[PDB]
Amino acid sequence: EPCVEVVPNITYQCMELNFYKIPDNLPFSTKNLDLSFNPLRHLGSYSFFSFPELQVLDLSRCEIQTIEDGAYQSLSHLSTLILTGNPIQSLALGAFSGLSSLQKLVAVETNLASLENFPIGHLKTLKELNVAHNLIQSFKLPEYFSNLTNLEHLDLSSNKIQSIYCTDLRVLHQMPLLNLSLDLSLNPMNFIQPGAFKEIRLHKLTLRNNFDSLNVMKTCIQGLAGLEVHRLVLGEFRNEGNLEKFDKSALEGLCNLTIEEFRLAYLDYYLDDIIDLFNCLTNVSSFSLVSVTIERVKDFSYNFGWQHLELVNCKFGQFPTLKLKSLKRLTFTSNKGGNAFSEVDLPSLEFLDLSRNGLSFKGCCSQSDFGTTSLKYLDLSFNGVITMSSNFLGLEQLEHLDFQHSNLKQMSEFSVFLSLRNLIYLDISHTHTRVAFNGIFNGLSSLEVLKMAGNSFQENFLPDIFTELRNLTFLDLSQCQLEQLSPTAFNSLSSLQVLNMASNQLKSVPDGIFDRLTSLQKIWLHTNPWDCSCPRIDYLSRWLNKNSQKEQGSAKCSGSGKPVRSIICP
Ligand SMILES: *[C@@H]1O[C@H](CO[C@H]2O[C@@H](C)[C@@H](O)[C@@H](O)[C@@H]2O)[C@@H](O[C@@H]2O[C@H](CO)[C@@H](O)[C@H](O)[C@H]2NC(C)=O)[C@H](O)[C@H]1NC(C)=O
Ligand SMILES: *[C@@H]1O[C@H](CO)[C@@H](O[C@@H]2O[C@H](CO)[C@@H](O)[C@H](O)[C@H]2NC(C)=O)[C@H](O)[C@H]1NC(C)=O
């Protein structure tokens, strides 16, 4: 069969097969058909009579110039239609006749010059329309949109809109039941007429790479006046040379909008102000700063009423002091600069993600660090040296804890989680941890996920350090340089479904070491130099054999490389 078969009687990827005609040899039950990159040229009446069940139809880049009325006539169960990259020069009035289910239409780069003559007014079930990268130069919304009641996403990015006039959204105004996300990214925009957005509300507005000047952006923002939006996103990724100044007053126009959530993604711009720059955002529930440089200023510590604060991929010069009474979720991630955590006062913080910053933590972890007792989630992975001093005092409600790839100090010779009786997920992988003290994990009676890959053990021996972890479901001991296991090590792990022991130096295991893993569903034992010289291997070869469905990858013996599951000992 020329057509690649992905899922029988369901999916087919007839990609680039020089099809001049729709393949008739295919089944009738096919729900997903990809005909992308085939010279179809013209889609005639009932082009798809042979596909009753079709739900997804990809006609990407099939040099289609004409689509006749009823080309998709019988496609009553089609939901997504991809036309992307077809040089359409003739669309009949009824080219989309029969598409009584269509929820998504992608018509990127279809030489579309305007929405006015686009014959889609009758597709009531349409939820998504993507017309990015066409020649559309008008923001005027066609009168048929009034029939497009379920439309939730309009993609107008990469077109030719330079001006938005007061008269452009009259039809949208008469639709006070619509929930529309609009993206106008990459339109050459210079003017938005004041008042055009009064009494308008959108779920989301994206404006990225739209303005040639931080004086033209301002003019366009003043024409946004009256707009009530759930999520405003302002992006600019085109800065080349030095870091560019983001004028402190460039945002004072945002006071005359209603925004619930705000993101500013201004690549290599730098802020020399905070308080007045972000004044018009004081009451936003979700604030977001991405890719910006914040050196001169270092204190968001005001009374901003933000509940969610996201600071990602920025340059800081120093870890900023934050003091916010209403912040519940903080995301401080993938930033560079000032490699040192500094105490914050964030009462009512429930979620704290501080991963991937290279930060050092000289004392950790307690309430006096964070200003909260409500912490449920704490992620300190991919940072520098974390020195433990406090056993999570004021933070006993923790349910998720992640330290992976951070250098942890004063943890292994202690019982630092003794108070964490609600902890469900703990990851200490690659934390320079060297196990000795059998008490390392005491107190973790409700723990289910324990990741400790890439560490090591005193004498490469795994002692009975999982005794009180009766709720354990997932355990990763991969890459731990293990040479010997304790025979009673997994005795309590009655609920363990996943055991990963791959990439160790295990030659053998104690007989009956899995006897009590009655819940075990998946096991990794590969990349270990197993020794298949009977009776030594008998227990393991026997166990892997009858439990073969459970084994992930392939355990093999040193030398022969024969699968350990394949060995039969006398
Ligand atoms: C941050 O919010 C406060 C209070 O929140 C009120 O905002 C009102 C405009 C309205 O949505 C109301 O329902 C909501 O409770 C704002 O205080 C308002 O300030 C204006 C002048 O700026 C006064 O005229 C209002 O009386 C006052 N609100 C009320 C009704 O007490 C505040 O302006 C706002 N600040 C920023 C930076 O946006
Ligand atoms: C071990 O896991 C069990 C089972 O999932 C947990 O039992 C739950 O306890 C909480 C706290 O009271 C209840 O809200 C749940 O309804 C219980 N689960 C059910 C449906 O049985 C237990 O908390 C965990 N830790 C232990 C036993 O200390």
Q: Are 198 and 225 in contact (CB under 8 A)?
A: yes
Kindly give the number of the ligand 1 atom that is closest to the alpha carbon of 280.
37
End-to-end CA distance of the chain: 49
**CA–centroid distance, residue 152 to ligand 1 (Å):** 30
Half-sphere exposure of 385 (CA within 13 A, CB side): 6
What is the Cα–Cα distance from 482 to 501, expressed in whole angstroms?
A: 9
- Rg of the chain on CA atoms, in Å: 30
- Cα distances from 42 to residues 45, 91, 133, 146, in angstroms, run 10, 11, 22, 31
- Cα distances from 240 to residues 237, 268, 335, in angstroms, run 9, 9, 20
What is the Cα–Cα distance from 218 to 246, expressed in whole angstroms?
A: 12
**CA–centroid distance, residue 223 to ligand 1 (Å):** 21
Q: Are 62 and 37 in contact (CB under 8 A)?
A: yes
Strands (E), 297-360: 308-312, 329-333, 351-353
What is the Cα–Cα distance from 354 to 371, expressed in whole angstroms?
A: 15
| Ligand closest to CA 257 | 1
Q: Are 58 and 33 in contact (CB under 8 A)?
A: yes
Q: Are 446 and 468 in contact (CB under 8 A)?
A: no
Half-sphere exposure of 66 (CA within 13 A, CB side): 6
**CA–centroid distance, residue 439 to ligand 2 (Å):** 23
Name the structure determination technique: X-ray
- Ligand 1 is surrounded, with C-beta below 6 A, by 255, 279-280, 282-283
Residue nearest to atom 25 of ligand 2 (CA): 446
Write out 139-194 in H/E/C secondary structure.
Answer: CCCCHHHHHCCCCCEEECCCCCCCEECHHHHHHHHCCCCCCCEEECCCCCCCEECC
Of all residues in the chain, what percent are helix, strand and coil, respectively (each to 5)? 10, 25, 65
**Strands across the sheet with 361-366, in order?**
361-366, 385-393, 407-409
Residue nearest to atom 10 of ligand 1 (CA): 258
Instruction: Tokens for 310, please give them.
Output: 């996201």
Strand partners, 57: 33, 81
Kindly give the number of the ligand 1 atom that is closest to the alpha carbon of 305.
1
Residue nearest to atom 11 of ligand 1 (CA): 258
What is the Cα–Cα distance from 408 to 472, expressed in whole angstroms?
A: 23
Diameter of the chain measured on Cα atoms: 89
- Ligand 2 is surrounded, with C-beta below 6 A, by 445-446, 471
Kindly give the number of the ligand 2 atom that is closest to the alpha carbon of 470.
1
Kindly give the number of the ligand 2 atom that is closest to the alpha carbon of 445.
28
**CA–centroid distance, residue 297 to ligand 2 (Å):** 47
Q: Residue 561 class from Cβ within 10 Å (0-12 exposed, 13-18 middle, 19+ buried)? A: exposed
Instruction: Tokens for 64, please give them.
Output: 């289609």
> What does 206-238 look like in DSSP terms, one character per residue?
EEES--S-TTHHHHHHHTTTT-EEEEEEEEE--
CB atoms within 10 A of CB 296: 11
List Cβ neighbours of 5 (8 Å cut-off, separation of 6 or more): 11, 12
Resolution in A: 2.0
Which of 421, 442, 446 maximizes ligand 2 atoms within 8 Å of its Cβ, making it the mutation to test the pocket?
A: 446
CB atoms within 10 A of CB 161: 19
Q: Are 372 and 397 in contact (CB under 8 A)?
A: no
Q: Sketch out the chain's domains with CATH numbers.
A: 1-570 (3.80.10.10)
Token pair 């009584």 is at which residue? 100
Q: Are 188 and 215 in contact (CB under 8 A)?
A: no
Using omega within 30 degrees of 0 as the cis cutoff, is the peptide bond preceding 535 cis? yes
In the DSSP assignment, the letter for residue 60 is T
Residue nearest to atom 15 of ligand 1 (CA): 283
Q: Name the 3-class secondary structure at 542.
A: helix
Which of 471, 472, 494, 496 maximizes ligand 2 atoms within 8 Å of its Cβ, making it the mutation to test the pocket?
A: 471
Residue nearest to atom 8 of ligand 2 (CA): 446
Strand bridging mode 4-7 / 11-13: antiparallel
Instruction: Tokens for 548, please give them.
Output: 């073969």
Strands (E), 23-79: 32-34, 42-43, 56-58, 66-67
